[PDB]
Symmetry: D2
Subunit: 495 residues, 4 copies
């Protein structure tokens, strides 16, 4: 097991690829322009990364289209596509230490989380999806004797995947697994705040046996190459994970261009509801702190609204404060660190401004509240809790995307539900109770794509993930994710 000194040495000894990847080769952007990739660990320069624009989008899509039409991947036998996807996952695992390190340096998450959660999470999405390919069956309708009615699925063609910076590799693999498994060509567009792991795995895909042109990667800004992909007249489908504001813009771009399918995973303000009869309050307290502090609270399913039944509030909140105290910001390259840096200065100032807004709107600070470790040249903030929060407060309505907890109380189940659903969002929610009826009925009443009962952040590759309402449309993970990347065809044959 590697030490802090080992990781620091490894970080120094990396050679970091920064180019885009098109038709099987790394390449500069057509303009030759780059942007600086800066580490939030200490501010070091990782790489000059290709800054792609519309011209590069055009070339990547021409490459994607041509590869799709050749059938090299899109008409490869299901069992061979499975084998290739599983080897692709295997190469992520074989290169886990470098990939984990890139992620940590790129966007600041703890090396033990990169290594233990992100890389295996990414590989598992690729291999599970690959495993599923020949387990899927299409349909034959019940028809008259002189008819054969087939209902089958086909790949849409060229897929644009636009992804965010909080789980760069894993979110990429959530798209890539099903999109590639179904036979599509994909143009992947990583966040400008974390381009490095996407750039790196382009090569691994080739090594696994993914044909040239099937997976192209275009680093660069959202408002340049990202927008260009979303407006492209020969992209069939765009899948997106990011902010709600940009998600809406993609719908507009699709309407302005070619009516491409649009699938969105956006923000969240997930309610974590703890009833007095929770089976294990200590477990509920640990999970409540984890739900907001893990990955610096840069998690769209962060349990950012803690709803607690009033009769246990006085006992429970100290338990949460105590639990939160074990999550301490520190050097991300130290294996012992469990909370890392925020992704950048812009992100940190947003979080600090929301903390200020907590004070302004009348909430009570009971833990954290300040920036720390300024001397490192990195960006760190204490996990923070506000008590006495009303659901109309800004820190209650708006996604903060930092480790900032809002605590709300209720006295009836019906009120807990009303408060929990009082949001434009609907990504996730949790319910803690030992009562059979109350568990299922409350879960059923919550308008969220994921509802966790007596746990937080549950589910694995078998569990569809995505939003109600303005948290998005469609689902990642499970077999349901495949439907985003395919079209139904009814073939009706007269005999």
């Amino acid at each position: 097991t590697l030490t802090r000194a080992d990781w620091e040495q490894r970080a120094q000894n990396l050679k970091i690829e920064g180019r885009a990847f098109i038709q099987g080769e790394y390449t500069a952007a057509a303009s030759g322009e780059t942007f600086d990739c800066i580490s939030p660990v200490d501010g070091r320069l990782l790489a000059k990364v290709a800054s792609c624009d519309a011209a590069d989008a055009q070339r990547a899509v021409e490459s994607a289209r041509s590869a799709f039409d050749s059938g090299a991947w899109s008409r490869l036998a299901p069992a061979k596509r499975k084998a290739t996807m599983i080897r692709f996952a295997g190469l992520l695992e074989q290169n886990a230490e470098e990939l984990a390190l890139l992620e940590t340096l790129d966007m600041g998450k703890p090396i033990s989380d990169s290594l233990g959660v992100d890389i295996p999470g990414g590989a598992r999405a690729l291999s599970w999806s690959g495993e599923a390919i020949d387990k899927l069956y299409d349909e034959v309708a019940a028809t008259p004797h002189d008819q054969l009615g087939l209902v089958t699925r086909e790949p849409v063609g060229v897929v644009a995947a636009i992804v965010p910076w909080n789980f760069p590799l894993m979110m990429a693999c959530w798209k890539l697994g099903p999109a590639l498994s179904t036979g599509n060509s994909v143009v992947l567009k990583p966040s400008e705040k974390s381009p490095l792991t996407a750039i790196r795995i382009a090569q691994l895909a080739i090594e696994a046996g993914i044909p040239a042109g099937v997976l192209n990667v275009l680093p660069g800004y959202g408002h340049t190459v990202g927008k260009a992909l979303a407006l492209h007249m020969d992209v069939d489908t765009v899948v997106f994970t990011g902010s709600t504001k940009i998600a809406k813009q993609l719908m507009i771009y699709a309407g302005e261009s070619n009516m491409k399918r649009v699938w969105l995973e956006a923000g969240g303000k997930s309610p974590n509801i703890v009833f007095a009869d929770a089976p294990d309050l200590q477990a509920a307290a640990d999970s409540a702190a984890s739900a907001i502090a893990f990955n610096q609270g840069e998690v769209c399913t962060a349990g950012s609204r803690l709803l607690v039944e009033r009769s246990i509030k006085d006992r429970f909140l100290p338990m949460v404060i105590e639990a939160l105290g074990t999550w301490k910001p520190g050097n991300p390259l130290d294996p012992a660190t469990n909370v890392g840096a925020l992704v950048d200065t812009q992100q940190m100032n947003t979080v600090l401004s929301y903390i200020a807004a907590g004070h302004t709107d009348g909430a009570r600070l009971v833990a954290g509240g300040k920036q720390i470790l300024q001397e490192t040249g990195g960006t760190y903030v204490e996990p923070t809790i506000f008590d006495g929060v009303n659901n109309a407060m800004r820190i209650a309505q708006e996604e903060i995307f930092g480790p900032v907890l809002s605590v709300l109380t209720f006295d009836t189940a019906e009120e807990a539900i009303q408060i929990a659903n009082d949001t434009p969002y609907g990504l996730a929610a949790a319910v803690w109770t030992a009562n059979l009826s109350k568990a299922h009925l409350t879960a059923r009443a919550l308008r969220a794509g994921s509802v966790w009962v007596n746990q937080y952040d549950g589910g694995d590759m078998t569990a569809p993930f995505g939003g109600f309402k303005q948290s998005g449309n469609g689902r990642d993970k499970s077999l349901h994710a495949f439907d985003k990347y395919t079209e139904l065809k009814s073939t009706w044959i007269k005999l």
Copy 2:
């Protein structure tokens, strides 16, 4: 069996309802404004129809939301929702002669078509969807022993349904069947060119046992109340059938407002491919004629591009011409009529303009081409055929929505396929051949939501219907239509 004079007497003796329907009662628009509903049959005033606007959209959505939240329909037992939907369908059939007559007077299709195709088709959509409700099963995931993972579907809430004028009742039922069966409230927005049947069935829904508020109907213009529904912040989903131009605008509206789900059924330029080894050339000829002339060519899946293998072209085209000659425009109230009036003067002008464009671009007129029966005060055009059409010509690229057939030739299956897919559309296609491999391989290669083999206009309620590319997203009919009206939820329970 009713005669022409019987239908004319019945037409005279109708009292026609023109009001909007909200919260279980017919009502004027808030503004008190109306528009004239004029028959294309002869020009008579059918009714002064409520002209709804944004205020009416607001009242109908508030009514829809409150109905949804009460659980009166959305939490009604599956078997009870089933029985109600089947009674709803039964009422359409019980009132078939009136509904068919309203349809024929409202938009000009022949009375024998309204009675024999539209009303039964609409009823079938309502009853089949109802029958299916308690035959559907959600999912339980394979999880560790201390987890229970449920994957269930829930109604989205408030659905706006915006539909066109070519099959007014049937297209509304395609939406209502699954949207209502899943428990949603629906605000239905019929075309301003054909509001009457939607207005009428609002009352039948109440009689069937659909609760007040669950089905509201808002006649009025697209750019007023239609746009208001698409922009409404408390509408969860909009489903649409209409032009590609407006479909795109709906995506824009959703992005501008609340990221509502958008499901689109749009235009088409469907290729009908006849190979030299078609098993029954006469059947192929009869079908080719019917595919362009049925419902005055005002059919989204009209076989408007006829692709013929060159070696049989000289024999096959005269057969198509003779078959088309049996399709003759006439009085829509005559039961013997198989081709009715176009919907309005604007539509006839569009069709005549495209006929002129056919001449212009260099095609050869071989049948029809003229307006007829002007003295009736109605709008009628001869079923028309252009020979020597190249796929680049305007009449081959652009949807005409009239009875105008373009005839193209090819020499290889590969060429046939290239021409078929050379279109922004992808709603339907057909292939005629006796050969096993050629049938399946050609069908597989065609980028269209429905592919019919050795028949045209096939499929029933078991066949999903909808577009590739700019012909839309999502499917109507079958069990797959239900997915447009529900959300997935993953409930992961720790035990």
Copy 3:
């Protein structure tokens, strides 16, 4: 609502059909022999019923086979089979009062039960199964590009259905619904203790539109015509509901003859587990009473072993005793009667013998225990409860098929589970607790086809029903029942 005197008048005025039914016509047995059908209500002669034997089995199977091969029903369009099955169900409901009366006179269950439970239950099985037919889809495999792999289901052909006397019409419909819906011909063999309703509905099937030969009915003894069907070389499948002893014999018959498929629904000794934290003890008490007394305890899933946590036993048992006191034997033709006659003298003797065995083995009689109403000429027994029962006792191990309840105690959930599964049977079980984990984990641990939580006798047509272990194989109701009446075919086509 009909009174007792109304029902008695109607009973007097029935003309009762006693013949077999083959190839669309009622018929005598080949031998001309009959058996007396005697009512347990008072002892009157209902009819002289045809006593079929091997020759009749042969004629009915030849008729079934020829009907099957003609395609008149087996190749009838799915939507047409659906409509016919729904009309068939409609005729049962249209003739509900006669059918219910036949059932009550034939085997002694209360008229309000026959009318309120059996006839609607039977109709529901026929209509739900019919509704499902065109909602089912077969499969298309994920194959290489030059292969098309179809996985479809086909009717087995000729089905023999052998059913018991406790729910004569309902058990027949459980078989007929799915067997007929899938296109099979059926030879139905009702119990010699209750042949009348099966004989009657043969005619209703013809009226609904079921073709001649598709449903044949052969009244007669198990060891004659029953055995002949099970041994017949041209019967493809036998489905059975009855005793475990005979179920086993059927497997032997199939091995001795033609390896026909054998699907069995056999006996049970279902445990009803009441934990101290049941949410509603009164509901639990009412249900415990109903679970043993309903239909005279002649119910395969009768909750005949009541397992009670020792800490609530002293409070709960008197509640069960009081609840059981509302269940009182009486004249089956009185609509107020909730407990009817046992089916015959032989059955009453068996029940009395088990009551005596209860005393013998050392249990404590706390309610009932005696035959009553002897002066009526009918066979009636008091609903009975033994306390202090050990699971090794005869009344705890052996199915009694009378209203005799055994009460056992436990201290831990683990012990409850061990006792519940300590049986050769596995048809049903129930668990009563308010606790989430205990509910699901206990339910998961119980080896039984149906597990009911905080209710007894739950489920509807959506719930598969059938046994673990010696309680049978395969399931009735739901879509899973269809699989007993079809075969899978893999059609792999090279293109």
Copy 4:
């Protein structure tokens, strides 16, 4: 690539395990008895193999039951069971040369077939089944709001698997893949004619991580240990592949014992129908010879009845004779050999007696017909063809299970179908035609579990495999195979 000399050296250098395997250890039979395992290659003694009896069955089942109840495998997380099954498959491949060699020496098939078909076939069944585990979902019924209806699958418990000698390892894996993947304990009972690969892989299962007791292997005779497993009162399910005669006996044993579920894969007499319009007659001829000569015609789907349209018979039969001539018996340890030895003297004399019966009943010998290579001390027979066969002849009705072809003619499709279905069997069939309608309609009319079109022996792990009629019940391969090893449970929860 290994030479004949290499394989002969390897064969000499094997140390061959002969013991049974129970609770994680190799063991003698309780009696200490053995039987000689003799190679049909040249007659050498491979090993003295444990001859188990009823006492060993008892001990293996006690071990199986105890392992199942411990939950070590039966309650292991789905994703971990998947991993273990995939490693199990991997160890088959890692030990492929030894396993292939054992199979070839044990029952005489060519080493290139053992290595190229059997071992990879076996591994693929284990890994595909393992891959499928967490891709399967159970069901949630549509129920009223106060109900939650779960329909789930659970492992049956202890499975006996009894397998034949023609594909010893592969047939074993067809059972083991799904049975183990679903969580059952399995007692595997290999043929006495080929025990060695089953004995050997018991150890590999342990190495892969299958817990002790989950997979026990009992070599020995059918009429001793095989019968004992089938009659055992604590075996829940027996799955069988073998002769039709013994398959029927298993049904009888189940009836005599505990009503255990019985799933059967038995014999076949598969029709290979070649129409005059077959797309590629040469391909049809090659496949027809392969269909009967591959694995010495010891294949239950052997195309043993060749049905040829009369108009091509004179051209086609010489093509078949010529093709068959390239299949030549030779030394099984020679990599060039494509037809090996028959399994033993008993089998060879059966085949020779059927060839004699071909002459007797009036058929015309047009190829092969004799035993050869007597000097080797092994058993070999020429691939043989009889012409002018009528379907009532013994060689037409009875499974021969040697390389003996019967040629029949027809002149209409309807006659081809009648002849093809004129059999007690229904395992497989094939159809060769270029015509779309004739292909699908003929395929639909054939009463066989597998129908191959324009190919023979098609399908992969996605295609269910098994019989109609006396060819068996249930299916191996695909997801459908899992249903043989699980029980449905309806858990109905009142909320």
